């Protein structure tokens, strides 16, 4: 019934740890300040160092962070579908959402700190700090699983834009904590309280410029009394080794009566594929690198999609199986998936409208208690055909709505889940 | 002739190391703020951890920091004697003076940074940062030699009081560097520019209160335009295992015609003792712990004291010898030695009146270039008889002026040198 996670290796172990130097602060530079674009290869090459040498302890921590990441991802994915999110489908990144939540937790104090911990499904003992998550162990374990994911060009980049009102000063230890989540961190100041819509225009133009990513960011304005926005931007890029684009276009059914003609990619490899008898769906796994897997889930028929989605995406992956690979001809739409949601909305959908509300104790973020506006998570996920265009096998053809997940075998972390209703 | 030290292990090795977050700062709390006294046992127990586990590399660094510490100590001891320092004698701590100099170096930029490096006798290549000292390696190597020194109650405590004018903000990375020199670091703000004498009264009362040390601090006022004072306070405490106080009092000759009757301690042990034939002085070494040694140097006669002092305290310890220990009855004054000097005065005596002068680039200390007043080093050195009062051996009796040094065998670091002219 009520599942609890007991991530012992991510807790504080020294009661004493939890007559003081005043904490140091800085003022972020204005959003207009000249900034070099993020180098996605420099980020990659680093994350790869941070997964290279790992003792047994590190893998124990990475296994426990995986469980909390997945569970919270499943819960927020459920919140996402209840709020409704565009016709093309849904997409969510548990590592990014989880990273966001842990960043706030690092800036928070009670009651907010234990409320974030409860959300994450870890028990709290009122009075006992050694039952509390150590956010630094958590972010460090999350960095390692990001590293394991990306071991030809296989990219995942997380960028954080931290937008504050003029005069709001950030605490040093807070921002140094955020660097563990991602080194690509841009604290910037701008006038939030006079033209919400142009403030969003500035953030969108800023993000496009430091990343070069074509993301379709939301255009809605910031609430005029916001002093802190915390936006997380995710770029995933994979190549399908040996898949190439097929000639012309092919029917993809949006539902039983409506089709769209789209470009498909196709490839033949040794993949794993099974049919689930109990619930009547099938699954295909294609490797993206040495540790990453793409899972493609097909309902037997279109009207069974919601039932299947709710089975499989909601807390262990009881349904992942490990059959012998077999010769498979896989045909699917080239995936260029864009998504964005405000964590505030998902939290409100989860009956926690005020967790990050006006009374949240976030006093470890800066010099005053911030007043948090949006907390966006945005994704660009790109699966590219590994080859240009121009033997017995089983045909799997994704020509109607399906679900997908990108998954890392060692930790068990789901890095993405989603649903394609209409590629376009 | 011109000696140069080439401490390769203390330099920067990565040229790249030497589009930026604004640096974080804080305002120190006012000098009146309620402060718990330093725990000298908590400091000791830590320094002892920091010397416990040390790879070969660490000892290589510690050997090189020793050379720079000794040489600069010898040079400043010479500066001290040229300026003249009270009738009872002289005392200087090379580790404390060196630590002070390196702290400034960490806060400095060119030309000041290379001028501090030149002072320390290390070559500089204009343009090449990999010829520069890495202050963090330096302070860390200095921490380890402090640790080796203190391995029954054998104490050495270094406290730093960093006194700034109201509104002057310290940089975070600067103060975190200073913590490597000593964790007992008290940045405090007070009005310097209205009553220099009461400002010194406040600092003296502050220091007495956080330490409990009876130090006889200087009473001179701060120059009215000072915004930064950097004062280092040193407490050394040793017990002479098996020495006890002798009945009554005994003649100590201040020069050939004048004596003072003082209490002496005395003890019989296996100590090392030799006569230097070439220069006609003798030396006795008594162990203070497992790594520390006291060296007692006697000139053959009182008028030869200056000559001998200048031979022995000015850059290698060519004159330290290692004979078989022998039965020695050592009689000497109980030593309670107090000393204080302003590094500014010694620097001016060394023809560097402006190294830390008004134009010194110290922009990595805080938000404005500080204007440095005094840089005091003060010492309380206490050698206690190891027992209360009530067998053939050689009598060594220190009944006229002599020199002393406290020395650590592994690194070769001199932690104190001095001269006793009059114990009182
Ligand atoms: Na652990
Ligand atoms: Na801090
Ligand atoms: Na385990
Ligand atoms: Na924490
Ligand atoms: Na080295
Ligand atoms: Na900093
Ligand atoms: Na060597
Ligand atoms: Na340095």
Swiss-Prot record, chains A, B:
For this chain, the Swiss-Prot or TrEMBL PTM comment says: In response to low blood pressure, the enzyme renin/REN cleaves angiotensinogen to produce angiotensin-1. Angiotensin-1 is a substrate of ACE (angiotensin converting enzyme) that removes a dipeptide to yield the physiologically active peptide angiotensin-2. Angiotensin-1 and angiotensin-2 can be further processed to generate angiotensin-3, angiotensin-4. Angiotensin 1-9 is cleaved from angiotensin-1 by ACE2 and can be further processed by ACE to produce angiotensin 1-7, angiotensin 1-5 and angiotensin 1-4.
Subcellular location(s) per record: Secreted
Q: Please provide, in alphabetical order, the Gene Ontology terms of the cellular component aspect for this entry.
A: extracellular region; extracellular space
An example Gene Ontology biological process: positive regulation of epithelial to mesenchymal transition
Q: Which UniProt keywords apply?
A: Disulfide bond, Glycoprotein, Secreted, Signal, Vasoactive, Vasoconstrictor
Return the Gene3D superfamilies for the record: Alpha-1-antitrypsin, domain 1, Antithrombin, subunit I, domain 2
Q: Which residues are glycosylated?
A: 14, 280, 361
Residues spanning the membrane:
none
Q: What is its main location?
A: secreted
GO molecular function annotation: receptor ligand activity; serine-type endopeptidase inhibitor activity; type 1 angiotensin receptor binding; type 2 angiotensin receptor binding
Cysteine pairs forming cystine bridges in this chain are 18-129
Its family remark reads: Belongs to the serpin family.
Tell me, what does this protein do in biology? Answer: Essential component of the renin-angiotensin system (RAS), a potent regulator of blood pressure, body fluid and electrolyte homeostasis.
The entry's protein name is: Angiotensinogen
Q: Which organism is it from?
A: Mus musculus
């Amino acid at each position: 019934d009520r599942v609890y996670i007991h991530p012992f290796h991510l807790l504080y172990h020294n009661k004493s740890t939890c007559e003081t130097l005043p904490e140091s602060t800085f003022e972020p530079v204005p959003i207009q300040a000249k900034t070099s674009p993020v180098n996605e290869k420099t980020l990659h090459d680093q994350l790869v160092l941070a997964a290279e040498k790992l003792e047994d302890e590190d893998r124990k921590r990475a296994a426990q962070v995986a469980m909390i990441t997945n569970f919270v991802g499943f819960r927020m994915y459920k919140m996402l579908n209840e709020a409704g999110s565009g016709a093309s489908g849904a997409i969510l990144s548990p590592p990014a959402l989880f990273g966001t939540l842990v960043s706030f937790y690092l800036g928070s104090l009670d009651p907010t700190a234990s409320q974030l911990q409860t959300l994450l499904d870890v028990p709290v003992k009122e009075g006992d700090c050694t039952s509390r998550l150590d956010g630094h162990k958590v972010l460090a374990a999350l960095r390692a699983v990001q590293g394991l994911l990306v071991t030809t060009p296989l990219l995942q980049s997380i960028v954080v834009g931290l937008f504050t009102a003029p005069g709001f000063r950030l605490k040093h230890s807070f921002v140094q904590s955020l660097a563990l989540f991602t080194p690509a961190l841009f604290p910037r100041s701008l006038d939030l309280s006079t033209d919400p819509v142009l403030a969003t225009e500035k953030i969108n133009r800023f993000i496009k410029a430091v990343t070069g990513w074509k993301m379709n960011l939301p255009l809605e304005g910031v609430s005029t009394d916001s002093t802190l926005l915390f936006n997380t931007y995710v770029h995933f890029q994979g190549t399908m080794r040996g898949f190439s684009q097929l000639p012309g276009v092919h029917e993809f059914w949006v539902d039983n009566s409506i089709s769209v003609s789209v470009p498909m990619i196709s490839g033949t490899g040794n993949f794993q594929h099974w049919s689930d008898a109990q619930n009547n769906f099938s699954v295909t796994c294609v490797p993206l690198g040495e540790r990453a897997t793409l899972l493609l889930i097909q309902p037997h028929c279109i009207s069974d999609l919601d039932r299947v989605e709710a089975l499989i995406f909601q807390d262990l992956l009881t349904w992942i199986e490990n059959p012998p690979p077999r010769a498979i001809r896989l045909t699917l739409p080239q995936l260029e998936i864009r998504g964005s949601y405000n964590l505030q909305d998902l939290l409100a959908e989860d009956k926690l409208p005020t967790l990050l509300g006006a009374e949240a104790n976030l006093n470890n973020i800066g010099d005053t208690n911030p007043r948090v506006g949006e907390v966006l998570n945005s994704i660009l996920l790109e699966l590219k055909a590994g080859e240009e265009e121009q033997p017995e096998a089983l045909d799997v053809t994704l020509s109607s709505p399906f679900l997908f997940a990108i998954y890392e075998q060692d930790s068990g972390t789901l890095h993405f889940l989603g649903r394609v209703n209409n590629p376009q």
